Amino acid sequence: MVAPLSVQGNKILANGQPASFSGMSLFWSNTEWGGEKYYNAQVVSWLKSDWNAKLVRAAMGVEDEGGYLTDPANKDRVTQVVDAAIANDMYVIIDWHSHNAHQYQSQAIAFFQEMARKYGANNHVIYEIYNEPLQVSWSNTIKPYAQAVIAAIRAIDPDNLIIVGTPTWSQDVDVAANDPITGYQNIAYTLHFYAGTHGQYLRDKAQTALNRGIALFVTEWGSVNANGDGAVANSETNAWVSFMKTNHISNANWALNDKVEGASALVPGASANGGWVNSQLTASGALAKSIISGWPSY
């Protein structure tokens, strides 16, 4: 049984102590976007057995073409991954993979209510309600949306973590920390980085947020450039890894996918059902597996 997770100040706790978990993000769930083939039980069990992953993220597209708003089959793919995470005793992040979620509050509420009713009794579930807000106000745009969605989840699932996206593609955790979400337990805040583009400047905003007493979760990170492509930046990735290990920050690498781009963990044609030998991982994938499998035990 995975531990129920909670927040106290800047820490996510398991069994009364800071704990952190490392794994992979799936790519966009969207129909015809390629990554959908990896949303299955075999992939989830392989990530556990071969990568020693403790976490998987289901990245459910929303207003993007082929996403949940126009194609509900996206949610069936999410369900497959959630069921498989629970069966494999892995945490699972249910991600509303939107850039504009404040426009779709009632849809988000209805979706997270269903997810909470069905899955809320499990320790495994982590709700991520707003992937990557753009250059929009924390106080006036994101936080009202978050308050409403959190109220709806908490009425059903009083405990399990809810992770809230932050301004500028989930960079401005320092801004969120000056106006945190109150009145509900076990709320944390999203930080996203790509080590080819982001370094100490972004680490400093993260440190500021931590010092101001909010907890961070890296629901998405890449070893490559911020556009999802380019060379693996080994040195800067190791810097980010140390930062996350020091501060007990959970992390999901982008992405378990076979598209030709730097962020893909897999070569094109890597099997939809797992079993990948090392020579079928990309430089990004091999580094991701190394970080995940070497993540602290707790």
Residue numbers in the entry: 1 to 298
Task: Reproduce, without paraphrasing, sentences from the article in which this PDB structure was first reported.
Cellvibrio japonicus is a saprotrophic bacterium which possesses the remarkable ability to grow in isolation using a variety of hemicellulosic polysaccharides as sole carbon sources. It produces a diverse collection of GHs, assembling enzyme systems that can degrade cellulose, xylans, mannans, and xyloglucans, among others. Effective xyloglucan-degrading GH systems (recently reviewed by Attia and Brumer) contain exo-acting glycosidases acting as debranching accessory enzymes and endo-acting enzymes (xyloglucanases) that generate short, branched β-(1,4)-glucan oligomers (xyloglucan oligosaccharides).18−23Exo-acting enzymes are expected to address each of the glycosidic linkages reported in xyloglucan branches, though the reported enzyme diversity falls short of reported branch diversity. The work presented here comprises the design and validation of trisaccharidic xyloglucan (“XyG”)-type cyclophellitol probes and their validation as bona fide, predictive tools for the identification of xyloglucanase activities and their discrimination from cellulase activities within a xyloglucan-elicited C. japonicus degradome.
